[PDB]
Coordinates of C-alpha atoms and ligand atoms in Angstrom, one line a residue:
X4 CA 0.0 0.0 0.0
X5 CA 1.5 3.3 -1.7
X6 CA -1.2 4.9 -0.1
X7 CA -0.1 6.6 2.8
X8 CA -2.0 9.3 5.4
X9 CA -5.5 8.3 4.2
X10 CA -6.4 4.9 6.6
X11 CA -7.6 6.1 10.1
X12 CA -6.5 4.9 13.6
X13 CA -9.7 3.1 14.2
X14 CA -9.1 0.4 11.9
X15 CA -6.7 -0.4 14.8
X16 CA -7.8 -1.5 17.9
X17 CA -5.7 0.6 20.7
X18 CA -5.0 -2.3 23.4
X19 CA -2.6 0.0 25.8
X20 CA 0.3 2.7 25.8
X21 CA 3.5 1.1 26.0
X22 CA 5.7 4.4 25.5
X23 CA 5.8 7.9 26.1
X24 CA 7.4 9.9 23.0
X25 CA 8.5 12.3 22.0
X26 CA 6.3 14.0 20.2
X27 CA 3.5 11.6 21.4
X28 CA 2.4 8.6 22.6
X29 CA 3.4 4.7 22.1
X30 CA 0.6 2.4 21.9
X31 CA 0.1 -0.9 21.3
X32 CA -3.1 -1.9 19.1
X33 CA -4.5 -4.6 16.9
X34 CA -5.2 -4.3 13.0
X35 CA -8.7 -5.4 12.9
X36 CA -8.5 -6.3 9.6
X37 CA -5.2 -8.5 9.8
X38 CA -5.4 -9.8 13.6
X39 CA -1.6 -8.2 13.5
X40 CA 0.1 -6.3 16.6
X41 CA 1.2 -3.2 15.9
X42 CA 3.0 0.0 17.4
X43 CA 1.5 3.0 16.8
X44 CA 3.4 6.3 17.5
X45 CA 1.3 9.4 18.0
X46 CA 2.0 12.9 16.1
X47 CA 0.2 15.4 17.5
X48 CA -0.3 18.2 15.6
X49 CA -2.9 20.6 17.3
X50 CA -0.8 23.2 19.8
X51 CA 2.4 22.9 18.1
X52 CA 3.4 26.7 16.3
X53 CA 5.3 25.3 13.3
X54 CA 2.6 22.2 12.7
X55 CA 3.6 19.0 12.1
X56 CA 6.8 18.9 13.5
X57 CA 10.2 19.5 11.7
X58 CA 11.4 16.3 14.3
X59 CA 8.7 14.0 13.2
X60 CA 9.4 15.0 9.4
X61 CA 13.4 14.0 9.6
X62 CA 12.8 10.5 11.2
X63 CA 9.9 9.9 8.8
X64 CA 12.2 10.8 5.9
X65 CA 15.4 8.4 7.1
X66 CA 12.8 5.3 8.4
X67 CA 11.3 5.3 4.4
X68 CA 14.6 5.2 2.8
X69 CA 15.2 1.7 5.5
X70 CA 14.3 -1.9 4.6
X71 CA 16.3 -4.3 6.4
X72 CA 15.8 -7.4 8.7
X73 CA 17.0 -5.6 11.4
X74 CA 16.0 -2.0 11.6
X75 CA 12.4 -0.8 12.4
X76 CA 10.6 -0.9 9.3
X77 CA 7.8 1.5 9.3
X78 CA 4.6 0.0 7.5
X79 CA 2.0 3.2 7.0
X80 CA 1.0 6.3 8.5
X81 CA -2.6 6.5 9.5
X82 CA -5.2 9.5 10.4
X83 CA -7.3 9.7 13.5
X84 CA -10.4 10.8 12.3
X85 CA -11.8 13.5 10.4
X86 CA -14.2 15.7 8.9
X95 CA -6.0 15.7 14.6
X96 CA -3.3 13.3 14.8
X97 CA -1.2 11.0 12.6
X98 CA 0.3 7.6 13.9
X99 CA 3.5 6.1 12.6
X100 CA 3.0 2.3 12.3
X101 CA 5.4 -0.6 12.9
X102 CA 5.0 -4.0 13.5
X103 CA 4.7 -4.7 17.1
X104 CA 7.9 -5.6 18.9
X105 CA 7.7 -7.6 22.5
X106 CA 10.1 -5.6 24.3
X107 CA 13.2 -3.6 24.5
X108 CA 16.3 -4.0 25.5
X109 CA 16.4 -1.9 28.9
X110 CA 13.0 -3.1 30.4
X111 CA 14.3 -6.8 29.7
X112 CA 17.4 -6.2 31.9
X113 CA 15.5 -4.1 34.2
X114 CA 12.5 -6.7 34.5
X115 CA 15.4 -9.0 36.6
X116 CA 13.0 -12.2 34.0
X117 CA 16.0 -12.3 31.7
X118 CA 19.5 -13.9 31.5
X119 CA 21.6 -13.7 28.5
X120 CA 23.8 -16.4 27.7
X121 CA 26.6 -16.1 25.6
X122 CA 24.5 -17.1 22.8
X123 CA 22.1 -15.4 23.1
X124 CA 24.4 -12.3 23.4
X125 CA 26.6 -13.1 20.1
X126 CA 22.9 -13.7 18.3
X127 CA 21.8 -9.9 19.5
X128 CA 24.9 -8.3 18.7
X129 CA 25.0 -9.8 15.0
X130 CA 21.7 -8.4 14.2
X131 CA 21.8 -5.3 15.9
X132 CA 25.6 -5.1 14.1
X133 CA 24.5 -5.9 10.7
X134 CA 21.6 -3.3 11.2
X135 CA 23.9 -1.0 12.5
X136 CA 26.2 -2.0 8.8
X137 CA 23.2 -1.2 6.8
X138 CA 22.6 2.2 7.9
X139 CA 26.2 3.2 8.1
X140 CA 26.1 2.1 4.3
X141 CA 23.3 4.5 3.6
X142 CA 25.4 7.3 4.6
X143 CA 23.0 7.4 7.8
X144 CA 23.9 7.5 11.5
X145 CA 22.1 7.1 14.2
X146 CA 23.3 8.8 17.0
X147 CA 20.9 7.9 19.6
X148 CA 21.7 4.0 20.1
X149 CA 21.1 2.8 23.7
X150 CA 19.2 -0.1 25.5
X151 CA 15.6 1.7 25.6
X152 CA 15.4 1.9 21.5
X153 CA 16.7 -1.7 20.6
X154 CA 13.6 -4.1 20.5
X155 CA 13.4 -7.2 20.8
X156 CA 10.6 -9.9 19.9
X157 CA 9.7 -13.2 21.6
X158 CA 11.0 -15.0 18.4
X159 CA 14.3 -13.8 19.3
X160 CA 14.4 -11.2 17.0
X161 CA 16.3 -7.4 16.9
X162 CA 15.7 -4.4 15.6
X163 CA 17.7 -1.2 15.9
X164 CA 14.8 1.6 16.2
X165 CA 14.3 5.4 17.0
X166 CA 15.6 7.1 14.1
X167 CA 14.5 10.6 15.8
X168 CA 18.1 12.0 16.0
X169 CA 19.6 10.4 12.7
X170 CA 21.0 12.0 9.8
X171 CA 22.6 11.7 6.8
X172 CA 26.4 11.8 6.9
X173 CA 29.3 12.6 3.7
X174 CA 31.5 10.0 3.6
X175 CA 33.1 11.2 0.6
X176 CA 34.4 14.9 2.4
X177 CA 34.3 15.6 6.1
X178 CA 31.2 17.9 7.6
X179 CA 30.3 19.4 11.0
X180 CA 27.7 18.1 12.7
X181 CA 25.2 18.7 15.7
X182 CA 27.8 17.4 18.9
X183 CA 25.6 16.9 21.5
X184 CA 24.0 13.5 20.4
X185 CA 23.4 10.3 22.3
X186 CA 23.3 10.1 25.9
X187 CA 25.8 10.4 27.8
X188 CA 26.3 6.9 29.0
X189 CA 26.7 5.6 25.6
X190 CA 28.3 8.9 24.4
X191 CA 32.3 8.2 22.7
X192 CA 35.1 10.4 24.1
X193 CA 35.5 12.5 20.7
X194 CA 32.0 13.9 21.2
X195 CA 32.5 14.7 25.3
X196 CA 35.9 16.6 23.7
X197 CA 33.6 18.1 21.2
X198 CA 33.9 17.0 17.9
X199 CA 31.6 18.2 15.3
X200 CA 33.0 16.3 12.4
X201 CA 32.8 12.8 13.5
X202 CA 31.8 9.6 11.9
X203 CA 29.8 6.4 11.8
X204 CA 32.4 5.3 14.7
X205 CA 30.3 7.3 17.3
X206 CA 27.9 4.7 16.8
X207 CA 29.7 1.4 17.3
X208 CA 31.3 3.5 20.6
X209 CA 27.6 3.2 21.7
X210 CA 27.2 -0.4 20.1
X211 CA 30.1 -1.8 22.9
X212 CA 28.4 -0.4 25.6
X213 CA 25.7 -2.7 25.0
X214 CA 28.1 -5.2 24.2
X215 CA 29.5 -5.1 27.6
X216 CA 26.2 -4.2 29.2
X217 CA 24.8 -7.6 28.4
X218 CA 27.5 -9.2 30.4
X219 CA 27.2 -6.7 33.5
X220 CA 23.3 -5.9 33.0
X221 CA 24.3 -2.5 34.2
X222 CA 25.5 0.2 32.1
X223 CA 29.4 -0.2 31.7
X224 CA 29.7 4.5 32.2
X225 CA 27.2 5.8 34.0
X226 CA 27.9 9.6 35.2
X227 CA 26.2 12.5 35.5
X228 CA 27.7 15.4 33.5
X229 CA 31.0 15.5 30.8
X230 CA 33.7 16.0 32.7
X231 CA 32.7 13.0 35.3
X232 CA 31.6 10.8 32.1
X233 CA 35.0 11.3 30.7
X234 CA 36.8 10.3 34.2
X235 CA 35.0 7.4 33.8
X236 CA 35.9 6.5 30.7
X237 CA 39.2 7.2 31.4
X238 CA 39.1 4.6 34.1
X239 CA 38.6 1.6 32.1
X240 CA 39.9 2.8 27.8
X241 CA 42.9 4.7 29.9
X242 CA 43.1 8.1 29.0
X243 CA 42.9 9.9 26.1
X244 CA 46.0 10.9 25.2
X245 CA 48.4 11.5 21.6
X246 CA 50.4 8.4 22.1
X247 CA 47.2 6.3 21.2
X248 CA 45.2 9.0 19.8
X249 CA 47.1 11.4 17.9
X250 CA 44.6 13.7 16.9
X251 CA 43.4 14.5 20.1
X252 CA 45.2 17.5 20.7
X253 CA 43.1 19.1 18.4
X254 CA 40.0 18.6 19.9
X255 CA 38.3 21.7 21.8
X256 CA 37.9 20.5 25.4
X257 CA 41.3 18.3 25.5
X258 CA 43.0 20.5 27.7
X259 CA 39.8 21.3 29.6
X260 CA 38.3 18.3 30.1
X261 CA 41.6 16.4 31.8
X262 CA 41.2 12.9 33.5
X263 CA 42.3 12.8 36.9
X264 CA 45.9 10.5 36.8
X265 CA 46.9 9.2 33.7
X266 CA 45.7 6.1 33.2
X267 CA 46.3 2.9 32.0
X268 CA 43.8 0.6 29.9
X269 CA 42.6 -2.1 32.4
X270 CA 39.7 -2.9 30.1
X271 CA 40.6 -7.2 29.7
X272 CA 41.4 -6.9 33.4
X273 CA 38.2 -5.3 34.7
X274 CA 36.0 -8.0 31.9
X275 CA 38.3 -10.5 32.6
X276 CA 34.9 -12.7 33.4
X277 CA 33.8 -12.4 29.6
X278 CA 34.8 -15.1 27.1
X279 CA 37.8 -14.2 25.1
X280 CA 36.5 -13.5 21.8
X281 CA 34.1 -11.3 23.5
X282 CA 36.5 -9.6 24.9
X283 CA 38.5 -8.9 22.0
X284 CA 35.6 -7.4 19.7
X285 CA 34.7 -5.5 23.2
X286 CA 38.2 -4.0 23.3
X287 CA 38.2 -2.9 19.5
X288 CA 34.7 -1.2 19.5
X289 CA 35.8 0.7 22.6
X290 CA 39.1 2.4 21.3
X291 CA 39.4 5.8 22.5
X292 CA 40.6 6.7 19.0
X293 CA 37.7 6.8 16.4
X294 CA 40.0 6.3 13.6
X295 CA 41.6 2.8 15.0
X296 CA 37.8 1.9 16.5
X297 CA 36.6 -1.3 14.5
X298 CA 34.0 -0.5 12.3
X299 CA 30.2 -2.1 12.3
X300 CA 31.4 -4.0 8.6
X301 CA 34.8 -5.6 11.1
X302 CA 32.3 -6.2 14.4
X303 CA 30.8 -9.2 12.0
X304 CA 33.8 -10.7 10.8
X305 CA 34.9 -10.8 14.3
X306 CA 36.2 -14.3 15.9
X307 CA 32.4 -13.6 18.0
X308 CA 30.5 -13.0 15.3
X309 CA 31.9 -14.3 12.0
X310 CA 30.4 -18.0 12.3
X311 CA 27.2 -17.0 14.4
X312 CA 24.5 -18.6 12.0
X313 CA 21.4 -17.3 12.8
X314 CA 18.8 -19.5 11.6
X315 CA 20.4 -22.0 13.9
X316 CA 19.9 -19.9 16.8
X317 CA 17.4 -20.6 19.7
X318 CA 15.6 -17.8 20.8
X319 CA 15.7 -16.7 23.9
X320 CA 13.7 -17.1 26.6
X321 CA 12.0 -14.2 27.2
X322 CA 8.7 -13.6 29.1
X323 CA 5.7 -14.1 26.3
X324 CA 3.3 -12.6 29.6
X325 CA 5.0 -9.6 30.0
X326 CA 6.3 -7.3 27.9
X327 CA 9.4 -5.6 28.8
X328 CA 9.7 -2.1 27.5
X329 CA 11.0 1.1 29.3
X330 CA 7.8 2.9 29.9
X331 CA 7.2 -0.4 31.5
X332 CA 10.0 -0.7 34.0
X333 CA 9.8 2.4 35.4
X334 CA 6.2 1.8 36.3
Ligands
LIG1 N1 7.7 -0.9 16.9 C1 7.7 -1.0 18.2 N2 7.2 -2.1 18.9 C2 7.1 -2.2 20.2 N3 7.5 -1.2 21.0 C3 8.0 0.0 20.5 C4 8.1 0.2 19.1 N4 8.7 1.4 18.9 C5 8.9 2.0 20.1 N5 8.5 1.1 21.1 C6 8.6 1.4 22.5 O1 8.3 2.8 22.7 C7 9.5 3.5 23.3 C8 9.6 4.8 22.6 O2 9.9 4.5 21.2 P1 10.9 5.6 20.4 O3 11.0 5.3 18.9 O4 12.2 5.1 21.1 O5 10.6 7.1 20.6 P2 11.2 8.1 21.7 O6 12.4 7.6 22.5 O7 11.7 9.3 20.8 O8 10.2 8.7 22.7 C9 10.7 2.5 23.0 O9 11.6 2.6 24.1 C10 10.1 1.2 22.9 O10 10.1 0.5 24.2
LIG2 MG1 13.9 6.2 22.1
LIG3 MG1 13.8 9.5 20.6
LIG4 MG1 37.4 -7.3 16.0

């Protein structure tokens, strides 16, 4: 169906809200035609001075030029009724990544680990090879269905990106957990690598179930950092000294990289793609292409994969978890 905007809500049968948006709403519903689940996200027009809003408009324009496996997929855009809202329609994913771990129902094997971080990796490939990043990866917009299935989602701060010529770009993207050291020592003109920065995070998330940095402002988020990558420094990142906030933003010793001690508990070839996607130095950091042909990843087959077992009574999404 070409035929976009025209098809109201009510064909859809709204069964709860599962998310609170941005610019509206998350709700899971029912198509009443098709017996299909569904998540509907809310634009509210009515109130807002420039109308329907510039945010909405970007993500809608990256999400149409996506079709793969593993990236949200958005199937129509439908009207309440008329004669005033639109709602962005995906296909209904059980859960997400943070109200899993949160929920305290989940434990990740190894397997199941390697199996998440191929999809959400080859994902992650796609977009990067459509000149798009995404600069907003973290636990609470990866999805995940009961079938075992990933989908990188939440295209609300993405944008196109020149690979063939440098470009400045907005600097104060992703959170600030999952945020890479170039951005805290504020690059503009950065790359894809900011993204696999946020990509071993997870990684090493899944083995902790807690959030690998987690600091309140900058300058503490960078001490952090610090802590376990060592610090930032021209010996292993040359370029450095050109960033803005090098000299400001300062760790407090001089630290050395105790990243394989500190994960020590991780299998080996985890280890070693979890060191390579957490490189201080964006230019040496593996890309999302060299992530799959990693010893962890290269020979993950995923049809022979089990899914998971994840809670089919409850579904674990952030909203969720904090309630
Ligand atoms: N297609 C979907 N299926 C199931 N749940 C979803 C879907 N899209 C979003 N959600 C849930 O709604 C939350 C908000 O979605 P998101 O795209 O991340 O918007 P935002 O973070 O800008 O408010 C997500 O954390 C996720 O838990
Ligand atoms: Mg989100
Ligand atoms: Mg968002
Ligand atoms: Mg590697």
């Amino acid at each position: 169906e070409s035929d976009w905007g025209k098809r109201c809500v009510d064909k859809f049968d709204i069964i709860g809200i599962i998310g609170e948006g941005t610019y509206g709403q998350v709700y899971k519903a029912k198509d009443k035609d098709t017996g299909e689940l569904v998540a509907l996200k809310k634009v509210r027009l009515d109130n807002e001075k420039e109308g329907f809003p510039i945010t909405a408009i970007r993500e809608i324009k990256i999400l149409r030029q996506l079709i793969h496996r593993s990236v949200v997929n958005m199937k129509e855009i439908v009207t309440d009724k008329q004669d005033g809202a639109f709602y962005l329609v995906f296909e209904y994913m059980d859960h997400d990544l943070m109200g899993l771990l949160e929920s305290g129902l989940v434990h990740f094997s190894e397997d199941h680990i390697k199996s998440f971080m191929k999809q959400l990796m080859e994902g992650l490939e796609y977009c990067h090879k459509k000149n798009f990043l995404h600069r907003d990866i973290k636990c609470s917009n990866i999805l995940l269905n009961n079938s075992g299935q990933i989908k990188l989602a939440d295209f609300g701060l993405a944008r196109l990106y020149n690979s063939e010529e440098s470009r400045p770009y907005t600097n104060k993207v992703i959170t600030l957990w999952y945020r890479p050291p170039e951005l805290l020592l504020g690059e503009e003109r950065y790359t894809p690598a900011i993204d696999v920065w946020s990509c071993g995070c997870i990684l090493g998330e899944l083995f902790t179930k807690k959030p690998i940095f987690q600091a309140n402002l900058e300058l503490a988020q960078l001490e952090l950092i610090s802590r376990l990558c060592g610090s930032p420094c021209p010996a292993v990142w040359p370029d450095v000294i050109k960033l803005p906030y090098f000299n400001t933003m300062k760790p407090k010793k001089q630290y050395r990289r105790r990243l394989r001690e500190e994960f020590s508990f991780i299998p080996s070839a985890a280890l070693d793609l979890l060191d390579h996607m957490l490189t201080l130095d964006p230019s040496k950091r593996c890309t999302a292409e060299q992530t799959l042909q990693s010893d962890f990843l290269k020979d993950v087959e995923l049809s022979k994969m089990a899914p998971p077992d994840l809670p089919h009574w409850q579904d674990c999404h952030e909203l969720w978890s904090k309630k």
